[PDB]
Each structure stands twice: as structure tokens, then as C-alpha cells.
């Protein structure tokens, strides 16, 4: 799949107050090399 | 003569509609087109749904 | 990313309360599923059923006060576009408009990463986020 | 689908319904054929345009109870023109619910590293509907 | 465990005040026990008595303003499932 287990694990108990919605949109961000490159361009901390 | 029997047979196969409904315009126009079909393996249910949606298109007040 | 997008409004919490209660309380009426499969976003069927859905949403928010048609996206956008304030409660109509504006803000927030350069034929936000691509397919579709 | 509407659909079903439902939805399947042939086609809808327009409804359990479930009381015939409205609407009907597979490879920047033969698999519920509440009346016609 | 479940809402304090006042105020009516032993959650009996329970809860929250049928779980779930706002006032229905 594209959506593994921890999406559902977070969505199980996420509080329903729009940070959960924005953070599911955030957790959809990719782990491509070009994704790492442009997140470093936009100063967004990747998962490393 | 045989074509009328095909029309009537398809009319009874569709729903068992009464001739009173056979006289209806939506039927009066489409029974001849349903004659040039249903001799194939197509279906019986398809004709019921077709009559449903056409009768519906007809009645838009 | 919310601080970087400068989109961090607290306007939507009261909307999310009523939407959450509607999605939680398992008393949703049966006719809504039948309407969601009769109309499918082609909107001429919706303009036919504009009074049936008026009566359903009107009673069902005005007395039961759980919001209706909060399942299908094309329904919840088509209500925001063509359904007005006439023959609906305006409180619920504001909630549908707020759901639309919330999805607008999500698209804005994670479309911060827009850089005017493509690589193969795909834009760079397509390479950024797997939610803007042609690889994810909106798991309930009606046409293609 | 426009690119915007497709993206907002992905946003809706992948963020907003799971975050506000806490994973409390279910995909559904529908026999539209058996649904329409059981909801109607028997008495009032084949009346040859004279009894139809002023007709008392068949008043079956299968459909008048659905409309009573959307509205209690306030209705003389209990289907006060609403069966006419719905029947006029349903020219725009569709297929049965199908599963679709999607075999797609990734973006090329992830295709590179011994991932050329990977083939992501997506099941997508074609022409179905999201569901949130336990259906009782139409259990014959709705598969979860 | 509340911080670990992230479920710590303040939505319910105004409900629980009224529920506690209803359970504490010892002027509960006598017919409600009879209704709770005739209907017992099988809900066809509730669809029979859907108007009598309507008049009871409507008067009893509109004038006494204490809640009714806050003893039996199957009653208080059935009021959430089938019962309507057309029958009993909205303030009471929101507490069920």
C-alpha cells in the first residue's frame, strides 16, 4: 500500500482539532531524495 | 405479423405490462426498438431498467 | 509548516465539534446513502433533488442536530456550491462552507512547497508530497 | 475531475474523514439494479401518466418507511410528491460497485535504487460509497 | 491515561451538573419505573410508548427542569437512538 499501519495508529486517538488534519497532510510528505532536498530548501525538518 | 408477436412477447417479458400501458407514448415509441433486440443473449433486466430511466426522463414536470 | 504558511486560524473548532458529533452518533438516516448513489456529482440530478435534500438536511439538522451528507466529498462540495440558504438552516450551511474552506486551507498549507520547476513531466510539489500526485487515487471514485 | 478537485478529494478522504471519524468508516457496495427494482417499478410508477400524477403511493414497507425515517408526520400521503421527485431524478443512475486495482510504480527518484520492479498496489472502490452507520433496512442491497 | 488517550474535553460539565441534580433531587415521578419495567429496551414497546415518554420528559424537563429516565442504561441509549427533538425539548435531548 501507500498507507501503512502508523497512519491508522495515529488516526485512532488523534484529537479532532485540525492539528490532526494538518498533520495527516504533513505525514503524507515523501522520503524521496528530491523531497529531502526541497524540504531542506524550505527549512522544514525531515525525519532524520 | 410475426413482428407484432415479437413486440408483444417482449412487452410481457419486460414486466408483463398491460396493453393499457403498451399504448403509452414512451412504450409506443420504444417497443419497436426493443423489437430489434432481445433476440440476442443480452438480458431481461436491462430492458426493465431502460424502461425505468426512459419513463423517468419523460416525466420531468 | 503552519507557522511557515501563516495559516493557523482557530475559526474551525466549533465546526469540527458538530461534524465530529455527526460522524460519531450512529443514527444517520438511510435515505442519505440512496441519495449519494443516485446523484454522483453530475449536479443535474442534484438540481432535480434540490428540494428532497433540502427537506432531509433541514429536518435532520434542525431537530436531530447532527449534520447530514458529511460522507461524500462531491456531495459536501455540491451542497456548498448550489444549495443556498433557502430551504436549509443557515447554521448548517455555514458548516458546509467551513468544511470547504478547511479543505482549502489544507491544500494551501501543504502547497507551500511549490517551486516553479519540473523534472520529468511532474511538478516539484508532486515530487514533494505524495498527496498531490497522480499515484494516489481518492479511494471512492465515480467516473475515473 | 479537475486537478484541484482531485487533490481536494485526496485531502478529504485521506485526512478529514479519518481524523474526524477516528477510523470509524466503512466502504460499501451496492446492487443498483436490485435496489431500484425493489424500491419501485411495481404499482405507481407504471401508471400511464394519468393515475401517476395524482396517485396515492404503493406505500410499501420498503420505501415509505425510508421516507418516514427522513420525516416524521407532516405528510398526508406520506410521500407528498417526494417519490415523484426521486423517480424524476433517477435517470442518472450508474454501475454496480466494483473494486479496481491500481498497479503503479513510484516517482522516478524512488524508482532508482533497486525499486524499478516494485509496483505499488492500490485498491480503489469504484462507484461505491463511504458508510458510517449500521444499515438495517437495506441489508439486502448494501454490502460492507 | 487521559493524557495518553488525548481525550480530556470540557464538553460535559454542564451536562453532568444537570444529570447530578436529576439523580439527587428526590422528586422523581412514579410512572417512570412502570415505563422502565414495561419497556425493557426491545424498542418495539418503545415505538408504542414513543408519545407517552415524550409527554413525560417534555413536562418534566420543561417545568420541573430535572432530567428523566436517567436510571436505566437501555432507556438512556434508546433515547439517543430513536427519540426525536420534535417530541422533547432540545436542551434535554442534548444531555442524553
Curated annotation (Swiss-Prot), chain B:
Interacts with the major capsid protein/MCP. GO terms for biological process: viral process. It is found in: Virion; Host nucleus. The keyword NADP does not apply. It comes from Human herpesvirus 6B (strain Z29) (HHV-6 variant B). Belongs to the herpesviridae small capsomere-interacting protein family. This is Small capsomere-interacting protein. Signal peptide: none annotated. GO terms for cellular component: host cell nucleus; viral capsid. Keywords: Capsid protein, Host nucleus, Virion. Its main location: virion. The chain holds residues 23 to 83 of 89 of the full protein. Participates in the assembly of the infectious particles by decorating the outer surface of the capsid shell and thus forming a layer between the capsid and the tegument. Complexes composed of the major capsid protein and small capsomere-interacting protein/SCP assemble together in the host cytoplasm and are translocated to the nucleus, where they accumulate and participate in capsid assembly.
Swiss-Prot record, chain D:
It is found in: Virion; Host nucleus. It comes from the Viruses. Signal peptide: none annotated. Belongs to the herpesviridae major capsid protein family. Homomultimer. Makes the hexons and eleven out of twelve pentons. Interacts with triplex proteins 1/TRX1 and 2/TRX2; adjacent capsomers are linked together in groups of three by triplexes, heterotrimeric complexes composed of one molecule of TRX1 and two molecules of TRX2. Interacts with scaffold protein; this interaction allows efficient MCP transport to the host nucleus. Interacts with capsid vertex component 2/CVC2. Interacts with the small capsomere-interacting protein/SCP. Self-assembles to form an icosahedral capsid with a T=16 symmetry, about 200 nm in diameter, and consisting of 150 hexons and 12 pentons (total of 162 capsomers). Hexons form the edges and faces of the capsid and are each composed of six MCP molecules. In contrast, one penton is found at each of the 12 vertices. Eleven of the pentons are MCP pentamers, while the last vertex is occupied by the portal complex. This is Major capsid protein. It comes from Human herpesvirus 6B (strain Z29) (HHV-6 variant B). The chain holds residues 770 to 913 of 1345 of the full protein.
Curated annotation (Swiss-Prot), chain E:
Belongs to the herpesviridae major capsid protein family. It comes from Human herpesvirus 6B (strain Z29). Homomultimer. Makes the hexons and eleven out of twelve pentons. Interacts with triplex proteins 1/TRX1 and 2/TRX2; adjacent capsomers are linked together in groups of three by triplexes, heterotrimeric complexes composed of one molecule of TRX1 and two molecules of TRX2. Interacts with scaffold protein; this interaction allows efficient MCP transport to the host nucleus. Interacts with capsid vertex component 2/CVC2. Interacts with the small capsomere-interacting protein/SCP. This is Major capsid protein. It comes from the Viruses. Self-assembles to form an icosahedral capsid with a T=16 symmetry, about 200 nm in diameter, and consisting of 150 hexons and 12 pentons (total of 162 capsomers). Hexons form the edges and faces of the capsid and are each composed of six MCP molecules. In contrast, one penton is found at each of the 12 vertices. Eleven of the pentons are MCP pentamers, while the last vertex is occupied by the portal complex. It is found in: Virion; Host nucleus.
Amino acid at each position: 500500500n501507500w498507507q501503512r499501519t502508523p497512519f491508522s495508529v495515529y488516526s485512532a486517538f488523534c484529537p479532532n482539532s485540525l492539528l490532526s488534519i494538518m498533520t495527516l497532510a504533513a505525514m503524507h510528505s515523501k522520503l524521496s531524495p528530491v523531497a529531502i532536498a526541497i524540504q531542506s530548501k524550505s527549512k522544514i525538518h525531515p525525519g532524520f | 405479423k410475426e413482428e407484432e408477436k415479437k413486440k408483444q412477447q417482449m412487452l410481457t417479458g419486460v414486466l408483463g405490462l398491460q396493453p393499457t400501458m403498451a399504448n403509452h407514448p414512451v412504450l409506443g415509441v420504444f417497443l419497436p426498438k426493443y423489437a430489434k433486440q432481445n433476440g440476442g443473449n443480452v438480458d431481461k433486466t436491462a430492458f426493465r431498467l431502460d424502461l425505468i430511466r426512459m419513463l423517468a426522463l419523460h416525466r420531468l414536470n | 509548516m503552519l507557522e511557515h504558511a501563516k495559516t493557523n486560524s482557530h475559526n474551525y473548532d466549533f465546526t469540527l465539534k458538530i461534524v465530529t458529533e455527526s460522524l460519531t452518533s450512529g443514527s444517520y438516516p438511510e435515505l442519505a446513502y440512496v441519495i449519494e448513489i443516485l446523484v454522483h456529482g453530475n449536479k443535474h440530478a442534484f438540481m432535480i433533488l434540490k428540494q428532497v435534500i433540502s427537506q432531509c438536511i433541514s429536518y435532520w439538522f434542525n431537530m436531530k442536530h447532527i449534520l447530514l451528507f458529511c460522507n461524500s466529498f462531491e456531495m459536501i462540495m455540491l451542497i456548498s456550491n448550489h444549495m443556498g440558504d433557502e430551504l436549509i438552516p443557515g447554521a448548517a450551511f455555514a458548516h458546509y462552507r467551513n468544511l470547504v474552506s478547511l479543505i482549502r486551507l489544507v491544500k494551501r498549507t501543504i502547497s507551500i512547497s511549490n517551486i516553479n520547476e519540473q523534472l520529468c513531466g511532474e511538478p516539484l510539489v508532486n515530487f514533494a508530497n505524495a498527496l498531490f500526485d497522480g499515484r494516489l487515487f481518492c479511494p471512492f471514485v465515480h467516473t475515473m | 475531475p479537475s486537478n484541484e478537485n482531485t487533490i481536494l478529494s485526496k485531502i478529504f478522504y485521506f485526512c478529514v474523514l479519518p481524523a474526524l471519524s477516528n477510523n470509524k468508516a466503512c466502504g460499501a457496495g451496492v446492487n443498483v439494479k436490485e435496489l431500484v427494482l425493489d424500491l419501485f417499478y411495481t404499482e405507481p410508477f407504471i401508471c400511464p401518466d394519468d393515475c401517476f400524477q395524482e396517485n396515492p403511493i404503493s406505500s410499501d414497507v420498503l420505501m415509505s418507511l425510508i421516507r418516514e425515517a427522513m420525516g416524521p408526520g407532516y405528510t398526508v400521503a406520506n410521500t407528498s410528491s417526494i417519490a415523484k421527485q426521486l423517480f424524476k431524478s433517477l435517470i442518472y443512475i450508474n454501475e454496480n460497485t466494483k473494486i479496481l486495482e491500481v498497479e503503479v510504480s513510484l516517482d522516478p527518484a524512488q524508482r532508482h535504487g533497486n525499486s524499478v520492479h516494485f509496483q505499488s498496489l492500490q485498491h480503489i472502490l469504484y462507484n461505491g460509497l463511504c458508510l458510517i452507520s449500521p444499515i438495517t433496512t437495506l441489508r439486502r442491497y448494501y454490502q460492507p
